[PDB]
Write a protein that binds this ligand. Structure first.
Ligand SMILES: *[C@@H]1O[C@H](CO)[C@@H](O[C@@H]2O[C@H](CO)[C@@H](O[C@@H]3O[C@H](CO[C@H]4O[C@H](CO)[C@@H](O)[C@H](O)[C@@H]4O)[C@@H](O)[C@H](O[C@H]4O[C@H](CO)[C@@H](O[C@@H]5O[C@H](CO)[C@H](O)[C@H](O)[C@H]5O)[C@H](O)[C@@H]4O)[C@@H]3O)[C@H](O)[C@H]2NC(C)=O)[C@H](O)[C@H]1NC(C)=O
Ligand SMILES: *[C@@H]1O[C@H](CO)[C@@H](O[C@@H]2O[C@H](CO)[C@@H](O[C@@H]3O[C@H](CO[C@H]4O[C@H](CO)[C@@H](O)[C@H](O)[C@@H]4O)[C@@H](O)[C@H](O[C@H]4O[C@H](CO)[C@@H](O)[C@H](O)[C@@H]4O)[C@@H]3O)[C@H](O)[C@H]2NC(C)=O)[C@H](O)[C@H]1NC(C)=O
Ligand SMILES: *[C@@H]1O[C@H](CO)[C@@H](O[C@@H]2O[C@H](CO)[C@@H](O[C@@H]3O[C@H](CO)[C@@H](O)[C@H](O)[C@@H]3O)[C@H](O)[C@H]2NC(C)=O)[C@H](O)[C@H]1NC(C)=O
Ligand SMILES: *[C@@H]1O[C@H](CO)[C@@H](O[C@@H]2O[C@H](CO)[C@@H](O[C@@H]3O[C@H](CO)[C@@H](O)[C@H](O)[C@@H]3O)[C@H](O)[C@H]2NC(C)=O)[C@H](O)[C@H]1NC(C)=O
Ligand SMILES: *[C@@H]1O[C@H](CO)[C@@H](O)[C@H](O)[C@H]1NC(C)=O
Ligand SMILES: *[C@@H]1O[C@H](CO)[C@@H](O)[C@H](O)[C@H]1NC(C)=O
Ligand SMILES: [Ca+2]
Ligand SMILES: [Ca+2]
Ligand SMILES: [Ca+2]
Ligand SMILES: [Ca+2]
Ligand SMILES: [Ca+2]
Ligand SMILES: [Ca+2]
Ligand SMILES: [Ca+2]
Ligand SMILES: [Ca+2]
Ligand SMILES: [Ca+2]
Ligand SMILES: [Ca+2]
Ligand SMILES: [Ca+2]
Ligand SMILES: [Ca+2]
Ligand code: NA
Ligand code: NA
Ligand code: NA
Ligand code: NA
Ligand code: NA
Ligand code: NA
Lengths: 287, 276, 291, 276
């Protein structure tokens, strides 16, 4: 079936008792991105220890889940009764087998058959692909995907942009504005390692007639070098239109006083992230 | 126009939101779907009873929730911070902010997805008399053996006619057997053989339990075999009163089963064969 | 200068090469060979502005998802970090090259003239088999059960003796239908013995010797087939046909009796269930003569 | 012609027929070698594979002859026997006599086309200066201020236009290894950084210039000028100086004078730098 919600699969002639010498395979097919749940309402077959005579063989996704026979209530039989039988993919193969004689080991017997009811269900693509394993490239999502019926769609963590493929995310970190009186500014995902290949302009614009006070916090960790300062990563600071220092390293830079109402912290990263980053408190005073 | 999924962000996300705003969003999914609305990010101006600034969840007329404050997800295995599930196909979300923000507040980021309503289980009232079937986007009812579903698409009813037995050796039982027989019903089963044969009915003395007779001995519920001029019955009580092997001397037999409104019991089962 | 999906080899040069390169310049050229190829490349001429740690000018070559090299300087000089001629191979089919140069190429404060570089790149075939990521391949199945083959561009698969390749060209079934035996003596064993036998089989092990001989079947130990003490051979069956007619359907743990056929044509039919727990069977068939 | 292929014994993997002689002609395109390998080998065993055999012939010569019962010893490899050839075609001939003592399943083999790395795979390299391999062929390249000759194989120097700035480079006489032109003066100039010394190497055998007169004065001459210092004039068959020469100068002028007649093969050299 190309597209179907639910359905019924019965033994032949149901409810009328089933004919002997019969084996038929019916295959349930829900559309792409759905699982197949099913249960039995009525179940009345020829019982046999190990189901030699008659049986219902239900198999899903290259594995036989069940081969079951007997009556709903009777022992010495392996009946499903009402148990859930879910597939993983979108296909569930059912088979029904019956020899020539169901009416011998006692005397005449009248066996009705079975009522299979099957629902479609949605599968959780996220928890399927990302639960364990999988280091090679697969179609799985970077920051978070979403599980909804049928398909799945993706989204990124606060302050990141989704790229065209709708699977991965870069940082935006271009027009990061700050107009409040005090505040905190931190490199993206602090104190975890900062993303590489960035052009950040953390802009502070307070009401004119104030002076800004920049207080760097610990830790302050950026890839530096003892020969030349800031070759890979740079944290430039512009104040009042002009640069006032390009910083990188391990000890925090000095607490800076600007005499300005407009500052811009420019952040340039390399193509690797080992160091953690930086965080600062900016406060306002009067002139 | 209705969708199965969607995104709702605070204005200017993930920057600071503007003051003196009242923005509303109307969530809508198709018929017979519930809604799961969950928040991936929450940083809003904190006030008691979320007075100053707030994000509001209203279903119909009633307030399903109201959030404010600075909050992040405690579980590292899940991004969800707050969440709601509703049995309705529409929702409303209202974000409002007063004229000032003392600190910088990034707002909120949330998403919604449409879920199937399992009409059988999700409600206390089940809309099927006998058996309920859920499917993605709706439901429909079903019935036990030799029951037929009534016009209202909801409740079922028993038939016990239309079946003519032509087999030489066969079985007959009361409806629902071994469960109790239905009340206020007349069940007639008919056997039709070749002229030369006799229908002989066997039923186990223990496989018979029908509502007992009154003090005077008249069966309030009864079972009776009609063979042309001869008639066997009425039979009732716990245990079959007749012999385990009964000869009707007839090739065509009508078995009638009468029940009143209350006073039901297990029922009966039988098997018949032929004799020249 | 030659990035193109369908191309074997190519040239990538510094700008204006051979003429010395302009200051204040950074350009990224990406090499792309077709699917299933690696990218090898080397430098013939190499003359850049040197700098301790290549702060000033550099050539940044990066592979699949990793920067392999960032190199600068002149072919011979020990002023640091020239590739010279060294091999730089990618894993996938794409190789990203970049060339960066600041404003000042004139050190000590007098003019200097730096030519650039000559990059030559070959395509190469990759060994899909030898990759060997045994798990973490559910979207593709790039590795084969019995054997795959490495050839240029693509790869194809094949099965061990006596198996058939099924549609996916990745996995194998058993053939085990027309298994013939015409020699005088011989050995016949269930597939992959004494390991567990495959399920879902219809085997016809046919013996046809020259007429005027009689066959002697001697079963060996072990003899292990899924049986049942109530009714014998419900799941698995090993039927034996002799001279056109069945002469016994066997299964169990103790071996069947040594059989003497009085026939020149026997057929052992083997029917398996849909699981393999038991091991199988093995037999020696020998020939005797008549007058 | 294909890039890959499969060859099986007749009736594989059953017993092969007797009195057979089957042949297969393998063919790959130009500039590819062939890797032919056997995954299964079970053939009637005879000394020098007399009775039954599988035969590998490339062109006119027998690359191999196999028989016997053999399986792969390496559990990490299915290959039992294998062959690699620098040729684009092969022949495989399987032949069997009229009897088999036991049942022999034959053989199963496969072939794949490999690129010839024309630079490395042969001892003779078809490029005078630099060789470039690619999948399916090759092409040549040259050192600084050399221009490649019409034959697409050997490179050549021009007498003028060249200022040498490379730290390690080559210089040759014009037309080399063909005879040098008459009545010409070719001066080549090397200009390095001041801190370096030009050190000139040229092979004792890579030098043949018109010999000197009886008095020992070179009629054609080659000479190195380093400011005040001067090496030469050199002439005759074979370089008279040492194979490794130190000039002690960062700028060097090499002058090559010839008269009207009496020409010879010429010379070739390569120079590098050394600090002071
Ligand atoms: C297991 O594998 C064996 C393999 O041998 C297989 O046995 C073979 O079964 C087939 C079944 O048909 C036999 O084939 C033919 O049988 C014909 C019988 O005809 C009657 O039955 C038909 C239905 O089966 C029906 O439609 C007809 O109307 C009729 O009622 C018979 O006519 C026919 O005779 C020819 O025999 C051979 C081919 O087998 C011909 O050629 C000869 O072949 C031999 C090699 O075997 C040799 O090369 C000779 O030189 C060559 O001439 C010949 O000319 C006759 O015309 C044919 O026999 C096979 O006989 C039989 N093989 C045997 C017994 O050795 C089993 O069935 C398999 N079991 C399974 C799969 O479960
Ligand atoms: C980081 O991000 C900030 C903001 O996001 C950028 O700042 C903007 O860009 C420049 C640099 O600060 C500013 O442009 C300058 O504006 C001055 C006056 O400001 C007003 O003018 C512009 C144009 O009318 C308005 O659009 C703007 O909103 C302001 O209201 C001018 O004085 C400057 O003009 C020229 O002055 C002299 C001439 O006398 C020249 O010598 C100068 O070179 C200059 O060209 C100039 O126009 C702009 O105002 C900033 N704010 C905005 C756009 O809102 C940073 O540039 C950015 N930094 C990095 C490294 O990315
Ligand atoms: C069950 O036994 C009976 C007789 O063989 C049949 O059931 C019949 O089912 C139909 C609906 O498909 C019912 O029809 C309706 O009857 C009412 C009578 O009041 C009439 O007003 C409507 O217009 C409509 O025709 C019918 O009542 C019902 N008969 C019964 C219950 O005796 C049927 O053959 C058998 N099987 C099934 C599945 O019903
Ligand atoms: C070594 O010396 C030769 C001397 O012949 C130099 O060759 C010069 O090459 C230029 C090309 O750059 C020739 O120009 C010609 O242009 C036409 C029209 O486009 C083109 O069809 C020709 O094929 C050729 O390229 C030029 O004639 C030639 N110079 C002289 C004086 O003849 C060069 O320095 C060195 N050799 C080569 C092959 O470059
Ligand atoms: C059916 O056969 C089994 C074993 O053959 C036996 O236990 C049972 O009594 C038989 N009769 C029935 C179930 O009526
Ligand atoms: C000139 O070059 C020398 C090289 O040793 C260097 O020490 C000096 O600083 C250079 N001159 C200037 C002005 O940089
Ligand atoms: Ca049966
Ligand atoms: Ca889904
Ligand atoms: Ca870094
Ligand atoms: Ca506010
Ligand atoms: Ca529903
Ligand atoms: Ca009653
Ligand atoms: Ca520069
Ligand atoms: Ca390949
Ligand atoms: Ca088995
Ligand atoms: Ca032979
Ligand atoms: Ca080649
Ligand atoms: Ca001369
Ligand atoms: Na960080
Ligand atoms: Na916001
Ligand atoms: Na009942
Ligand atoms: Na086996
Ligand atoms: Na063979
Ligand atoms: Na010469």
């Amino acid at each position: 079936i190309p597209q179907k919600l639910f359905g019924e699969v019965t033994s032949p002639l149901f409810p009328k008792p089933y004919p002997n010498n019969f084996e038929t395979t019916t295959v349930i097919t829900v559309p792409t991105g759905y699982r197949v749940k099913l249960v039995f309402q009525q179940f009345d077959l020829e019982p046999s220890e190990g189901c030699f005579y008659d049986y219902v063989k239900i198999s899903a996704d290259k594995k036989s889940l069940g081969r079951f026979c007997g009556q709903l209530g009777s022992p010495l039989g392996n009946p499903p009764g009402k148990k859930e039988f879910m597939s993983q993919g979108n296909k569930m193969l059912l088979t029904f087998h019956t020899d020539f004689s169901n009416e011998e080991n006692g005397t005449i017997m009248f066996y009705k058959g079975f009522l299979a009811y099957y629902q479609a269900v949605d599968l959780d693509e996220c928890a399927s692909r990302s639960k364990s394993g999988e280091e090679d490239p697969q179609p799985q999502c970077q920051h978070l995907c979403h599980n909804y019926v049928g398909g799945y769609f993706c989204s990124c963590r606060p302050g990141y942009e989704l790229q065209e493929d709708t699977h991965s995310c870069q940082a935006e970190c271009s027009s990061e504005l700050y107009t409040e009186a005090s505040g905190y500014i931190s490199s993206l995902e602090y104190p975890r390692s900062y993303p590489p290949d960035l052009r950040c302009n953390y802009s502070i614009r307070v009401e004119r007639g104030l002076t800004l006070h920049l207080k760097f916090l610990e830790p302050f960790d950026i890839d530096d070098h003892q020969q030349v300062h800031c070759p890979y990563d740079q944290l430039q600071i512009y104040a009042n239109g002009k640069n006032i220092g390009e910083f990188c390293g391990k000890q925090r830079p000095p607490d800076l006083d600007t005499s300005s109402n407009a500052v811009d912290l420019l952040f340039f990263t390399d193509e690797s992230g080992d160091s953690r980053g930086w965080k600062l408190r900016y406060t306002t005073e009067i002139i | 126009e209705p969708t199965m999924y969607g995104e709702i962000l605070s204005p200017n996300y993930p920057q600071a939101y503007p003051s003196e705003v009242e923005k509303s969003w109307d969530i809508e999914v198709p018929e017979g779907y519930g809604i799961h609305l969950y928040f991936t990010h929450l940083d809003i101006e904190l006030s008691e009873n979320c007075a100053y600034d707030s994000v509001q969840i209203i279903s119909g007329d009633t307030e399903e929730g109201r959030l404010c404050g600075q909050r992040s997800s405690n579980n590292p295995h899940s991004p969800i911070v707050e969440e709601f599930q509703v049995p309705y196909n529409k929702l409303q979300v209202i974000f409002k902010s007063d004229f000032s923000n003392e600190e910088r507040f990034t707002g909120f980021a949330a998403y919604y997805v449409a879920t199937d309503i399992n009409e059988c289980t999700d409600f206390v009232d089940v809309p099927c008399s006998h058996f309920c079937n859920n499917f993605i986007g709706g439901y429909f009812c079903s019935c036990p053996p030799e029951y037929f579903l009534h016009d209202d698409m909801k409740n079922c009813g028993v038939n016990c006619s239309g079946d003519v037995f032509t087999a030489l050796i066969g079985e007959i039982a009361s409806p629902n057997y071994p469960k109790p027989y239905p009340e206020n019903s007349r069940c007639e089963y008919q056997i039709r053989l070749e002229k030369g044969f006799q229908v002989v009915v066997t039923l186990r003395r223990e496989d018979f339990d029908v509502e007992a007779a009154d003090s005077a001995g008249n069966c309030l519920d009864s079972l009776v075999f009609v063979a042309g001029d001869r008639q066997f019955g009425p039979y009732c009580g716990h245990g079959f009163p007749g012999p385990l092997n009964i000869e009707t001397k007839s090739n065509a037999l009508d078995i009638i089963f009468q029940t009143d409104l209350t006073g039901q019991k297990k029922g009966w089962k039988l098997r018949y064969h032929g004799d020249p």
